[PDB]
Design an enzyme around this catalytic site. Structure first.
Site, PDB file in Angstrom:
ATOM      1  N   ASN A 190       0.845  -1.333   0.123  1.00 27.81           N
ATOM      2  CA  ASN A 190       0.022   0.004   0.140  1.00 27.81           C
ATOM      3  C   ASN A 190       0.743   1.249  -0.075  1.00 27.81           C
ATOM      4  OD1 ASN A 190      -2.123  -1.966   1.912  1.00 27.81           O
ATOM      5  ND2 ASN A 190      -2.682  -1.236  -0.159  1.00 27.81           N
ATOM      6  N   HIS A 192       3.303   2.341   1.974  1.00 29.42           N
ATOM      7  CA  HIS A 192       3.640   2.705   3.489  1.00 29.42           C
ATOM      8  C   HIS A 192       5.107   2.187   3.789  1.00 29.42           C
ATOM      9  CE1 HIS A 192      -0.344   4.505   4.947  1.00 29.42           C
ATOM     10  NE2 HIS A 192      -0.719   4.099   3.719  1.00 29.42           N
ATOM     11  N   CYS A 227       6.784   7.447   8.812  1.00 26.54           N
ATOM     12  CA  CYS A 227       7.707   8.155   8.052  1.00 26.54           C
ATOM     13  C   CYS A 227       7.193   8.014   6.610  1.00 26.54           C
ATOM     14  CB  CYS A 227       9.215   7.554   7.911  1.00 26.54           C
ATOM     15  SG  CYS A 227      10.149   8.095   6.642  1.00 26.54           S
TER      16      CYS A 227
END
Ligand SMILES: O=C(O)C1Cc2ccccc2C1
Ligand SMILES: O=C(O)C1Cc2ccccc2C1
Lengths: 269, 268
Positions: A190, A192, A227
């Protein structure tokens, strides 16, 4: 891998790969963490969770909710060598409205001896607003179907290390690694940053002399903020202690916003 | 995994893991490359090579020699999805005194269809001086025992892509990613940067729009010099066209070349 007889936990065996080992020809803590992630994902798939990359229940999808990791705690007694088989058992449990826990036990497949254990805490978040919230009754009821109802903890000990409060490291740090940034391989399906990447970034500021003379026994890591794929991170470490202990902080390279804090404990080889 | 009936090749099946897939929920090219490395190492272990990180023969250890990768070429027709099983067959072959080759064929385990293929060229080096060398008669004889004697090539096609010369990209690059550096997870058991890490660094300078609209079909990468664990790398890319790109990895400071390559991408 498969669910156990009672359908309330899941087990899978892994053969340690050549590229998964470090200097000692044994699996790194990041390899162990990736195996914990994999067996957790296979367990979620086995009990009806989504395969979109966020592992959500039916009520979660309707309300645009996702689970996010708040803490990971791993204790390793022996690291498996290249070619060895490690068996990992995992299960979940609700903790009222606070959130949920996923626990793991790692064993040497040949001897049946416990070689490690881990616990993670998860909190509920709205996927759109990114706002944290409590677990609703309808979600709690869905968990009851695949989780043991009596407490089952990988870390039963009184007021054990896995629940300890972690302080914020104060400047100046004793050691630092600056300008760390994720590449595509660090992202999940996804886009991330993968949770395991943050463990690697924490460990980057441990001096090489410690890595060469000690073995990591315990790591506890809090996750405060993600992050982003275009962010840059500084990794800070300060010794707090035959055992060496460290305090860790990951923060954005510019304004210094905290993304993670943690502790590690290392034993002389 | 196991050696085949004739003892001249090796096969292993892998179940694609959750963390090994990209946005398309299919294995990345770096995951494929790691699987090629793993099946290659298991094959070397099965035929008597050393298990100390440098798969070395008995006469190579005596002379302090190691094999080093000169080129990797991978062509993928379909990437396996999360949970799918991919079977990979690998074998080696000597190429006289030039060096050796390791080839691979990837298949969909359920259908038996070929989904990819790869070839790598290796050269001999003295481990202490780092000086390149020709393959001696004694090492060629040791290879002849576990390699097919008639040519067996993953890329038989006439003057094919895997052997094409790659030019050096000229400044200014169309795209760049600067300041890349290896972390501990990028190192192998002997503290050298893993070969797969360089593929990731090459791909970092491909614009995200290409990655979102295309699939990587072919990557050819030459290895000129190692990135040390304390080095910093810049990744440069220029479009040469299906989309085609020319790539260059060089040290961030003086600009010493570490790798050059090309990629070919097809619209999804
Ligand atoms: O992400 C997961 O699935 C869990 C396993 C893992 C490994 C390293 C850090 C956090 C977590 C939580
Ligand atoms: O390192 C190896 O064993 C071979 C497999 C691999 C994968 C990526 C790049 C180079 C190579 C050569």
């Amino acid at each position: 891998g498969s669910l156990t007889e009672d359908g309330l936990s899941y087990k899978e065996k892994f053969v340690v790969r050549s590229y998964e080992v470090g200097s000692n020809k044994t699996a790194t803590v990041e390899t162990i963490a990736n195996l914990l992630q994999e067996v957790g994902c296979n367990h979620a798939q086995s009990v009806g969770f989504s395969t979109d990359g966020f592992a959500t229940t039916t009520t979660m999808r309707k309300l645009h909710l996702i689970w996010v990791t708040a803490r990971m705690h791993i204790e390793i007694y022996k690291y498996p060598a290249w070619g060895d088989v490690v068996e990992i058992e995992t299960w979940c449990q609700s903790e009222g409205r606070i959130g949920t826990r996923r626990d793991w036990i790692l064993k040497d497949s040949v001897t049946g001896e416990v070689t490690g254990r881990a616990t993670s805490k998860w909190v509920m978040m709205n996927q759109d607003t990114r706002r944290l919230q409590k677990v609703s009754d309808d979600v709690r009821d869905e968990y009851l179907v695949f989780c043991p109802q009596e407490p089952r903890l990988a870390f039963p000990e009184e007021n054990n290390r896995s629940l300890k409060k972690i302080p914020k490291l104060e400047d100046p740090a004793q050691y630092s690694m600056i300008g760390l940034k994720p590449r595509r391989a660090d992202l999940d399906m996804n886009q991330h940053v993968n949770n395991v990447t943050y463990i690697g970034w924490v460990l980057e500021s441990i001096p090489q002399e410690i890595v060469d003379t000690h073995e990591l026994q315990v790591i506890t890591l809090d996750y405060r903020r993600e992050c982003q794929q275009d962010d840059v991170v500084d990794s800070l470490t300060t010794t707090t202690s035959n055992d060496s202990q460290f305090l860790h902080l990951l923060r954005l390279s510019g304004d210094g916003q905290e993304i993670n804090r943690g502790t590690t404990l290392w034993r002389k080889k």
